[PDB]
Structures are given as C-alpha cells and as structure tokens.
C-alpha cells in the first residue's frame, strides 16, 4: 500500500480535495488507503469510496463501449488489443474494489446500513465485470444477483422504503435485470414497486430526506420512461 504511511484522516481529507479537483483516480487511491487502515467507514466515508470508484470505472466503461463499438464495426489487431487493454484495466479496478469489500468491509459491517451499502457495491462491481465478460460470465452474473438480492432482503427488513441507499440499490438492481440478466420485466416491476412504495412514504420525511428520496425516485421514473 503506497498510502500506508499517510494518516487515515489525511487520506480522507485528500479524497475530499481530489473530488473537488475532479481527480477521481487520486480520490480512489486515497479512499483505498483509508479502507486499508482496517477501521470501519462512516457514512460519509462510504460515500467517498463509492463516488471515487464509480467515477473511475464509469470512465473506463464509457471508453470500453466506444472501443467495443469500433471493434464490432471492423468485424489489424490494434482495436482488439486496445479494447483488451482498457478491459483489463477495468477488470483490475473491479477486482480491487471487490477485494476491499471482501478484506474486510463486508464481514465487519454489523449495522444494516453499512452491510446493505457494501453488498450493493458488490453487486455493482460484479455487474461491471459482467458487462465485459464472455462466457465465467454466468458465474459473475449470478454472483451479482446474489449480492444485490441479499442487500434487498436486508434493506426491506431494516430500512424504510425512502432510504436513499435502499432506493439506489433497487435502481441499480433493476438496471442489472434489464441490461445484464436480459429480464426487462423484472427490471420494470422492481423500478415501479420501488417508486410506488417510496411515494407512499414521502409524507414521513423532513425537507432534507424528501430531497434525497425524490432525487432517486426521479431516476427510477427516468429508467421506466426509457423502458416502456
């Protein structure tokens, strides 16, 4: 760990600065270092970890999609080689995040809020691996589904339907169903049920909670509009 010599608090502070500078690779390295200190992460710290790696892998996914499309049309070795290079780097980032979750964020997350957060992340990074997998692929897909479903089960027992982690989990699991599992009806049913159950609970929310929940509800609606 190249971050092993830096104080945990300094790593968190620098992750926040990297975010403001849109330096997401740095942000992810700082947050990896913070995780490797071995202590549990607070809610803010989990959000910092998630934002950093989401942005890094999101850039890799966007690039992979551009290159894959070019490769498909072309069907020399260069396009394949370069797509493979990006793919391998993306898989490396996913393996790194899954490694952090397995060593040892998930096992040490006692609270439902933390366990759901990390199981959602596990589903997300298996989903990103599944996007680029080509057969191996089945095991990755089933692994994503199992992580998402365990998170769903916990979230339903322990969180209200407006909780933003529960909502984002359902949003992402719905996308998994649509784009990975080739189960669009499951995707649509989950987004709709999630939206309707949250709508019925908005009356319980303060102004701040209402803003969080309705933001994600709009994303659910956006996806349903795309899919129907």
């Amino acid at each position: 760990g190249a971050m092993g010599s830096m104080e945990r608090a300094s790593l968190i502070q620098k992750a926040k600065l990297a975010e403001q500078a849109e330096r997401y690779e740095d942000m992810a390295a700082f947050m990896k270092g913070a995780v490797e200190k071995g202590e549990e992460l607070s809610c803010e710290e989990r959000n910092l970890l998630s934002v950093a790696y989401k942005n890094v892998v999101g850039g890799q996914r966007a690039a992979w999609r551009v290159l894959s499309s070019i490769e498909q049309k072309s069907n020399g070795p260069e396009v394949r080689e370069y797509r493979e290079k990006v793919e391998t780097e993306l898989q490396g980032v996913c393996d790194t995040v899954l490694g952090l979750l397995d060593s040892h964020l998930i096992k040490e997350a006692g609270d439902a809020e933390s366990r759901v957060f990390y199981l959602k992340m596990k589903g997300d990074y298996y989903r990103y691996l599944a996007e680029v997998a080509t057969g191996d692929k089945k095991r990755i897909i089933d692994s994503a589904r199992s992580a998402y479903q365990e998170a769903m089960d916990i979230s339903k027992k322990e969180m209200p339907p407006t909780n933003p982690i529960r909502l984002g989990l359902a949003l992402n699991f719905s996308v998994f169903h649509y784009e990975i599992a080739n189960s669009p009806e499951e995707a649509i049913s989950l987004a709709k049920t999630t939206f309707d159950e949250a709508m019925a609970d908005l009356h319980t929310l303060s102004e701040d909670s209402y803003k969080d929940s309705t933001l994600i509800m709009q994303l659910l609606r956006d996806n349903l509009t795309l899919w129907t």
Binding site: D124, G168, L171, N172, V175, Y178, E179, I216, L219, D222, N223, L226, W227
Partner: peptide, 5 residues
Amino acid sequence: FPATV
C-alpha cells in the same frame, strides 16, 4: 444508458 447511483 440507464441511470445508476
């Protein structure tokens, strides 16, 4: 592509 968070 669809929204995820």
